[PDB]
Assembly symmetry: D2
Homo-oligomer: 285 residues x 4
């Protein structure tokens, strides 16, 4: 398959006031990432896409739109995880059918699952779809058990545990790791992660790529300067409301990024809009 290393934006979705998908806005978000953020790929249907508040049919519509808009211009990963394994298989089969380059799946949540249940969940998605898989963050022995399946490619690493990150890269050198924390891209890159999947790349993809590339070249003081500016921006984004602020920043770039999906607050308050305007002036102008 296609090269999956590098910078992947976790695709945000544009929603209408009524909560339905705004297709025109979603396609503008996709075009912004490919053409302006210059991402290596998109991670579709993840947490950042407000995926878990949606129906199976809405998830399928998003997978269709993103693949139709992106075509073969960039790599595409489809997050199909769920508490419902039959739904994960159904979404995995559909994304595979659409031509996604690989699948990914959050560990099943809501209930507490044992490690064997989690491994069976990943092995079943893989067996039923025929597609390769990127897991989510478990310790070194458990990653080894997951990696016994040759179709598990690696992990979207979110644990804030850089000792575990080092251990994983040492023990499983041929498996890939994508950093899942945009605000810790530098230290993750210092340990040799293969790429990053993140929500903030939808608007800060230029700096993210710079950090990643400068860090791999050993230009740590300059990379740190860019991580500092990036984190000032991320700090403002987190305080103001993560998905709504990224969408409001996209609107300032002429992208119809729309509303958030309920039960998340759907409409940005005037204060949230004002803060996004300030953040754009300070960090993205």
């Amino acid at each position: 398959m296609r090269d999956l290393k590098g910078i992947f934006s976790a695709l945000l979705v544009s929603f209408n006031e009524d909560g339905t998908i705004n297709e025109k806005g979603l396609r503008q978000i996709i075009r912004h990432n490919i053409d302006k953020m210059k991402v290596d790929g998109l991670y579709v249907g993840g947490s950042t896409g407000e995926n878990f508040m949606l129906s199976t049919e809405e998830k399928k519509e998003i997978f269709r739109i993103a693949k139709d808009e992106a075509k073969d211009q960039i790599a595409l990963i489809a997050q199909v995880g769920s508490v419902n394994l039959k739904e994960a298989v159904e979404l995995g089969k559909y994304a595979t059918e659409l031509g996604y380059d690989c699948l990914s799946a959050v560990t099943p949540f809501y209930y507490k699952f044992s490690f064997p249940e989690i491994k069976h969940y990943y092995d079943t998605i893989i067996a039923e779809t025929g597609s390769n898989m990127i897991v989510y963050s478990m310790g070194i022995e458990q990653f080894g058990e997951l990696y016994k399946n040759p179709k598990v490619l690696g992990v979207k690493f979110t644990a804030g545990d850089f000792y575990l990150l080092e251990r994983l890269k040492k023990a499983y050198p041929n498996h890939l790791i994508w950093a899942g924390f945009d605000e810790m891209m530098l230290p993750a890159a210092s340990l040799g992660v293969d790429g990053a999947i993140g929500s903030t790349f939808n608007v800060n993809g230029v700096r993210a790529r710079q950090i990643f590339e400068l860090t791999k070249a050993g230009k740590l003081k300059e990379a740190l300067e860019i991580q500092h500016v990036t984190n000032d921006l991320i700090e403002g984004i987190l305080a103001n409301g993560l998905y709504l602020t990224i969408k409001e920043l996209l609107k300032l770039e002429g992208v119809d990024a729309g509303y958030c999906r309920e039960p998340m607050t759907s409409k940005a308050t005037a204060e949230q809009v004002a803060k996004a305007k300030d953040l754009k002036a300070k960090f993205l102008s």
Copy 2:
């Protein structure tokens, strides 16, 4: 509406080997609770029913079967909560249509929601269905905000916080509380909870009722004796695997309680079956 105080079993669902609903087995589980466990009601579609691993259509089939089998013999509460608010509304409307006595909804999960988002979620389910609501476990000021909606009846209390339980009963005396922890029924009843919703009542409903009634009469030494035997049983159930052990115990009573739903381990190992046989001999014979 119908009296909702007392003992409610959180209904377990029988599944076939392939994960589909075993309707004949589900109806036997329902009949066992009404006719033998002598419950005051059933709480359908909750955590114990393996609800969160199911499709919207499977949840509807379970709501239909339970209401058709129970008819008007007992009170019926329908848990319709989800990370998807549109799905919660759709399930709430269907359960209301079937004649369920009231709805209930877990707080939206997977994402971290603010209190205002959680209140909006409950107010929306109520507004769109016209049904009363039982919330899930937040502090005293937040319960007060939820209780501003006159259609919020009370809470299925799971927090292991008996100071908060006392505060809630004092501050909101006309709102109901159902204990959600079977192993702490006595102390909850000592503080005046109005009933209990629990998974273990599917097989230990006689002792549960005895504990509740003895405790309300102030017969605490005898209630404690029955809670001790109950908790020896619960301890064995938890160690062996909660839903599978209750199902295996039901099979020993001639109830086709079936398999669990994947991603949970679906089939009981021989060791799990042996332990259930031992538990039945010691506590339910």
Copy 3:
């Protein structure tokens, strides 16, 4: 042995402005507990006594003062636990020499001690002093969570009599009484006295009994007689008081409440804030008027 069941105040200590012990004030706190609060005994050197911010010599002084003032009128338990096991042994020997009825010790904290290390700590304090022991479990401050099997191992030592229980885990509490029915349990959460009494605890050790011991005894005795409605009413009033005490600052508010009774309860010890603000004082007076008048 001198009976250890019932109502025990976790003794508060009066400090001067400079942090030294105010002996006169401490004796007034003790008298107030014995004579007005009608306690069965005092738990001296616990968390409520500001014990872990003090020197070994200060701890010995408080032990001497409390035994000299109380004499033989009440039961006395001495909390001597610490991260320093040699200090715990030193304090346990001294409290034993003074005539304390039993020792108690918090699980060793700061470092992440294994269960075997925790068990060796209790066995050493007992062996070196010859005194009985009450395990002091307070997971919220120590981070130490011991399960039912671990209590069993501790109870293999016949001089371990029971536990001062503060976990907010009533399942574990029930399991302790099921497994070790003859071992004692003292509830450590005053705001949850009713439900703990419903599960058969043998007494209670608490900070709010320094000012609310009358109500605390009522809740305990009414619950044991099965008078739940009456007990719950007194727990409700108690918990309005406790809610206010907690919001205003626990240590300082109980001392200010005691000062309004004529007890020189003094200042708190630094690094805790030593002096109450005007707002804290005003709130203490309002709480006294409403609940202890």
Copy 4:
């Protein structure tokens, strides 16, 4: 001021079988660090020194011994924090009198101190001694989490120079360097030295540097020169060693590794298990053969 940047071993202390300090052994540990580990300095009286299980007088003895043995060859930092603020002041004055270059103090623990109380604690130690201060942050043991605004308040005192950072939060670490670029940071997690060095920490204070100081300096200096591939290789070998040390028992394994070098590192202090088992000794020898040979 005497430069405080670089590699600092958190000094381990040699104890006799009865728990008393083994002075000869402690001097050998110090010599080993200065002469073979080539440290820039020692952090004395920290968690690794088994400090919180000791008496004030034992702490003073370790401070005297370390300064007398090291003389002026290296930088010396004295950790004097405690739940007892009067003890921290007493120890800070004594370490200042002995000539320690700077003081350090763990956030006060056990009780849930507010931020203002924590800030008053640092300001008091500084004011009463006249010495500079390094905040010691170790949320995993204390449960105290301070955010960026709180560090700012602490840094309002110009004698607070920086922090010994152990949180497993590299976002916070980056925020500290962004906001207070001239304030110092010492990484406190030896297994995460590379990524912390990528974020510009000024040095490292760690327990494994007592035996792995050569590799630790390499990782630090290679990372600062941007030689990531080389640094990562040495971090990999280091982390195989650390993984084994952690699994076998951290304190005891480092002491056993030191004994294999001819250093009388002694026993651990009780309530920690004092003697290594035969299996722990055998594993220490295997780790030495593989990684420190």
